[PDB]
Design a protein around this nucleic acid. Structure first.
Lengths: 106, 106
RNA sequence: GUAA
């Protein structure tokens, strides 16, 4: 409810970037309405938030070819997959760069 | 391996705590050999490490009643469930406290 | 463990 998502689509994946107002409470997970995504594509998840949030979100996209978790130092780290990307693989993405010009956070 | 686990087992869950040497690289996920756990029980995961490690780990226990991700400020945040516990619920455990006296990290 |  009080947390907004952005959904950027590319051929090889759909990036999902979240933004959080202030501190969050775990209770909020009961109410998050997760962006719907093209299931023929792996997903990359980014956003500044605590670990539980990321884990929660990553799970919710498990039915997809893969889930990669962004890390500004490295890129997007595959953490689970059903595709030819393997866990530990790194997708070259720079999120700070893709979000230039600014993106509507729905 | 570069990474050791501890498993503390309790009626209402199996706590899994990890410890990491150095800065890890994502490659390592190809090699982690995950502790096998009583499936009649949810799991709690704790350890200082990057997000992708946690997310990876949490996924790997998804076959259990639930997965909760530890947070020293709050307790253990459920992030997946097939038991009574709901996502966003908080299990009351203090890991810094349960590890007093030292626990063999296998 | 609020992008170790």
């Amino acid at each position: 409810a009080s947390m907004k998502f952005a959904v950027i689509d590319r051929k090889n994946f759909t990036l999902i970037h979240f933004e959080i107002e202030k501190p969050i409470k775990p209770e909020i997970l009961k109410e998050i309405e997760i962006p719907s995504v093209d299931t023929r594509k792996g997903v990359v998840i980014s956003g500044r938030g605590p670990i539980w949030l990321h884990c929660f979100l990553a799970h919710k996209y498990h039915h997809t070819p893969f889930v990669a978790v962004y890390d500004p130092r490295l890129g997007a780290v595959v953490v689970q997959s059903h595709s030819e990307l393997r866990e530990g693989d790194v997708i070259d993405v720079v999120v700070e760069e893709i979000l230039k010009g600014g993106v509507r956070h729905v």
